């Protein structure tokens, strides 16, 4: 009933402006214990009244689950969102995923951002991974939909570090990050790399061991 | 400014999160134009006996009826929600559900941070009639009811009876974001 949110001045209003003439919507719905609904829905105006019709059709509900056997309770809020810096931090982000810079992620740019961080990732994984957010089911991960999931985003960090420090001597040096840098995509200057080793390197020996590493990682 | 340096730090650290399994649940909508069309991405809990929580998600396509006239599209944004039902009968025959919403500014974007334009056919105060129909599992059903609410505040109540198919044999609440 989109009609009534609280739309402050500075956003456009989609749902206000379309009258007299409303608006349509085609939604669907995937459970995490598998039960799928389809709804379309028109949203019209009669004489001072909205007027809306909706159909929906759920299918693959357990049995056994709890909407088959009526045992909810109600919904939680619905109140998460990311700051305006995060989106611009996570637009950065994705374009290491987005190296043709198009505007959708790939299974073949996901695969290599996960090789160049050291990743041995099939085909059965590289679906499975991008079938979890893909919203829309084309294939691909655009930029609303990997917002959607770094939101929903030790062990691994240490595999970081171990990809990241080339010789196993504890110590990412310049020339590795350079390395892991540049093939994931990064554009930048020797000068800034050696930058990067600085802002990580607290006790000023010239290179990033794991703890400063976690510090800027995390 | 962010210091150039930890940016790349942390978009780094970032595409190391991406990768990695072990995803939470989240409760959140995302607005986002596609065409001329207004997308939306929502990730919901439902409350389970017991408390635990099923979670479930959604992608909509919102498309305006007005086929000449500008209409001034957003760009990314968030809506908060509380959907919190008031009263059941017996066997979720009839049920009395309102909800607050808002949308949320995240950033200048799409239609610049300047708002559209107010319509006059949206009153301060506005009635809603509403009929859904279909099936879950197979079973159909027809439900209708009235409301109405305050658009400009983002408050509503509605009213809904289930006029065939009762007592439906799963939990209402799956219905109560689609009328
Ligand atoms: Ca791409
Ligand atoms: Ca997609
Ligand atoms: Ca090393
Ligand atoms: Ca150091």
């Given amino acids: 009933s989109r009609t009534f949110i609280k739309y402050p001045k500075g956003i456009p209003d989609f749902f206000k402006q379309s009258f007299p003439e409303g608006f349509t919507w085609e939604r669907v719905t995937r459970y995490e214990d598998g039960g799928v609904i389809t709804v379309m829905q028109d949203t019209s105006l009669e004489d001072g009244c909205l007027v809306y019709h909706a159909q929906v059709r759920g299918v693959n509900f357990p049995s056994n689950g709890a909407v088959m056997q009526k045992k909810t309770k109600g919904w939680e809020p619905t109140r998460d969102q990311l700051t305006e810096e995060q989106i611009a931090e996570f637009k950065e982000a994705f374009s290491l995923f987005d190296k043709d810079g198009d505007g959708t992620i790939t299974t073949k740019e996901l695969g290599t951002v996960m090789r160049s961080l050291g990743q041995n990732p099939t085909e059965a994984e590289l679906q499975d991974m991008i079938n979890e957010v893909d919203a829309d089911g084309d294939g691909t991960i655009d930029f609303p939909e990997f917002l959607i999931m770094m939101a929903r985003k030790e062990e691994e960090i240490r595999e970081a570090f171990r990809v990241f420090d080339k010789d196993g001597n504890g110590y990412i040096s310049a020339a590795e990050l350079r390395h892991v840098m540049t093939n994931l995509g990064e554009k930048l200057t020797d000068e800034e790399v050696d930058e990067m080793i600085r802002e990580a390197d607290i006790d000023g020996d010239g290179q990033v061991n794991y703890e400063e590493f976690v510090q800027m990682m995390t | ?179």
């Fill in chain 2, 1 to 179: 400014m962010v210091d150039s340096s930890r940016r790349k730090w942390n978009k780094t650290g970032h595409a190391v999160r991406a990768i990695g399994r072990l995803s939470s649940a989240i409760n959140t909508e995302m607005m986002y134009p596609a065409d001329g069309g207004l997308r939306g991405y929502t990730h919901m809990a439902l409350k389970v006996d017991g408390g635990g929580h099923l979670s479930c998600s959604f992608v909509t396509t919102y498309r305006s009826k007005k086929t000449v006239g500008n209409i001034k599209m957003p760009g990314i944004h968030y809506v908060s929600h509380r959907l919190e039902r008031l009263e059941e009968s017996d066997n979720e025959m009839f049920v009395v559900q309102r909800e607050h919403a808002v949308a949320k500014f995240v950033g200048l974007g799409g239609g610049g941070g300047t708002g559209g334009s107010m319509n006059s056919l949206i009153k301060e105060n506005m009635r809603m009639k509403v009929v859904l129909e279909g099936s879950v599992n197979g079973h159909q059903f027809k439900c209708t009811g009235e409301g109405e609410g305050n658009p400009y505040m983002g408050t509503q109540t509605m009213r809904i009876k289930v006029i065939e198919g009762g007592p439906l044999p799963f939990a209402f609440d799956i219905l109560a974001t689609s009328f």
